Amino acid sequence: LPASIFRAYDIRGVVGDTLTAETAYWIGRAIGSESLARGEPCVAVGRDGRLSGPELVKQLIQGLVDCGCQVSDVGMVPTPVLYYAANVLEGKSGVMLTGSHNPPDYNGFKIVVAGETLANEQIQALRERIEKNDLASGVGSVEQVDILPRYFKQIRDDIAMAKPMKVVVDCGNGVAGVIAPQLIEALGCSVIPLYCEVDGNFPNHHPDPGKPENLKDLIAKVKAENADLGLAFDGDGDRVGVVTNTGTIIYPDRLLMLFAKDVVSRNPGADIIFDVKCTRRLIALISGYGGRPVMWKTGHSLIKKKMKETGALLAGEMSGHVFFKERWFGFDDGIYSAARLLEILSQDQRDSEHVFSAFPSDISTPEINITVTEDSKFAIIEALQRDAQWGEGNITTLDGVRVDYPKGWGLVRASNTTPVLVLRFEADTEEELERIKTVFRNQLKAVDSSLPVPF
Numbered sequence: 363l364p365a366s367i368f369r370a371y372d373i374r375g376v377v378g379d380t381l382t383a384e385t386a387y388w389i390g391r392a393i394g395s396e397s398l399a400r401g402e403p404c405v406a407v408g409r410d411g412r413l414s415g416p417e418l419v420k421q422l423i424q425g426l427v428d429c430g431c432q433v434s435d436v437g438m439v440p441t442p443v444l445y446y447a448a449n450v451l452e453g454k455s456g457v458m459l460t461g462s463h464n465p466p467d468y469n470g471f472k473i474v475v476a477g478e479t480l481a482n483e484q485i486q487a488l489r490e491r492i493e494k495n496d497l498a499s500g501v502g503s504v505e506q507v508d509i510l511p512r513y514f515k516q517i518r519d520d521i522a523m524a525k526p527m528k529v530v531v532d533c534g535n536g537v538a539g540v541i542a543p544q545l546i547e548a549l550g551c552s553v554i555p556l557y558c559e560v561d562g563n564f565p566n567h568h569p570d571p572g573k574p575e576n577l578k579d580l581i582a583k584v585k586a587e588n589a590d591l592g593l594a595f596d597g598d599g600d601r602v603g604v605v606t607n608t609g610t611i612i613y614p615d616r617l618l619m620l621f622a623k624d625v626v627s628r629n630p631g632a633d634i635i636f637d638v639k640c641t642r643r644l645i646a647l648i649s650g651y652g653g654r655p656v657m658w659k660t661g662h663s664l665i666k667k668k669m670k671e672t673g674a675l676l677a678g679e680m681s682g683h684v685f686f687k688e689r690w691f692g693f694d695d696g697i698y699s700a701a702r703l704l705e706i707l708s709q710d711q712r713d714s715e716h717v718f719s720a721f722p723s724d725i726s727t728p729e730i731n732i733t734v735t736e737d738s739k740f741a742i743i744e745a746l747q748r749d750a751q752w753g754e755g756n757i758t759t760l761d762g763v764r765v766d767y768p769k770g771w772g773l774v775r776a777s778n779t780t781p782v783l784v785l786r787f788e789a790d791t792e793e794e795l796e797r798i799k800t801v802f803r804n805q806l807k808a809v810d811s812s813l814p815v816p817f
């Protein structure tokens with residue numbers, strides 16, 4: 363098997379190329395073996411709306427079956443619906459066959475075993491099982507399970523909208539189209555659908571709401587139709603993007619402010635987790651309402667683990683994964699997060715533009731990317747962590763180098779998947795912002811004077 367498909371938080375490859383049917387089988391074999399080792403013979407299996415789904419999933423299922431596992435096949439569903447299955451079915455294991463937000467040819471696996479979402483060394487351990495033939499053998503079973511109606515009802519029964527809203531819903535032709543428009547409607551909204559037909563060719567924009575260019579059609583439709591809100595889901599439904607009635611994009615750190623206010627209001631002292639890319643204003647907001655802010659690493663799987671470790675009721679990260687434990691199950695779920703957002707907004711007399719603009723904000727840069735090289739990217743961060751002088755800033759090295767100052771903050775980290783440094787800066791004033799940019803510019807240039815620093 364190619365080692366490269368075994369990534370930090372999932373398995374991902376190009377179907378017919380680095381991910382063949384044979385490899386999918388051996389992966390199912392590895393996962394079923396790991397599940398049995400943890401005392402869990404019952405595994406749910408789901409797939410998104412990709413072209414290779416209906417056939418590749420059979421290999422995954424056969425791999426699991428050939429271990430002696432009891433497979434519950436939930437068919438084509440959003441990723442968090444698969445996570446839901448692995449919470450309400452007999453078994454606490456689940457495999458989602460998905461290529462997320464990537465081009466049509468990509469597919470892969472997101473993996474929960476006996477309640478744990480696998481990351482890092484646990485994903486490498488699956489490959490090692492295959493290479494070592496450390497695999498179970500048995501005669502397993504397959505049961506067809508229709509879980510979407512249970513998921514639908516679960517959400518509808520617990521969400522209480524206070525006023526009707528008109529909402530544009532952009533699914534980007536991904537699998538969220540099976541439920542997001544119908545569920546939002548059932549909550550008491552009018553829904554304007556955009557690209558809600560499931561189509562693995564992704565013939566319109568690719569379903570990745572983290573890139574503003576993929577929100578252009580959403581913003582245009584919201585304004586044209588005088589809608590109250592726009593929502594965009596990623597390909598598999600574990601992420602959501604948000605635009606207000608005037609078309610302002612609301613980033614996940616700002617969405618988390620609204621969610622934290624609400625959750626902490628019912629749950630004094632609750633831990634709330636966010637990643638190192640989130641605004642410092644979110645830290646103050648959480649603390650101000652009496653919650654405990656916990657800053658952690660970027661990365662869906664890691665945030666999820668941290669939630670279990672801290673007992674946090676809510677977590678989110680800047681790419682759009684939002685995790686509710688309060689009233690829910692603790693997994694990331696763009697569809698449920700959209701329902702929770704609608705619940706809050708419906709209770710307010712203000713438009714969604716003014717709900718969000720009431721919150722404090724720093725002056726911030728956009729996210730900055732600098733392309734370096736695969737040979738240099740981690741060493742640049744190490745040099746910054748080892749040799750840079752940051753003055754009196756609170757330095758966080760959980761994930762790159764973040765420095766929080768009394769009036770601003772800055773981050774540089776290396777991308778896991780590309781030869782790129784990722785940066786963001788904020789401050790309460792322009793003067794302070796420039797001071798913080800200069801500290802980072804200077805520290806970077808002190809590592810390599812030819813680094814292409816664009817700020």
Ligand SMILES: [Zn+2]
Pocket residue numbers: 441462463596597598599600601
């Ligand atoms: Zn996703």
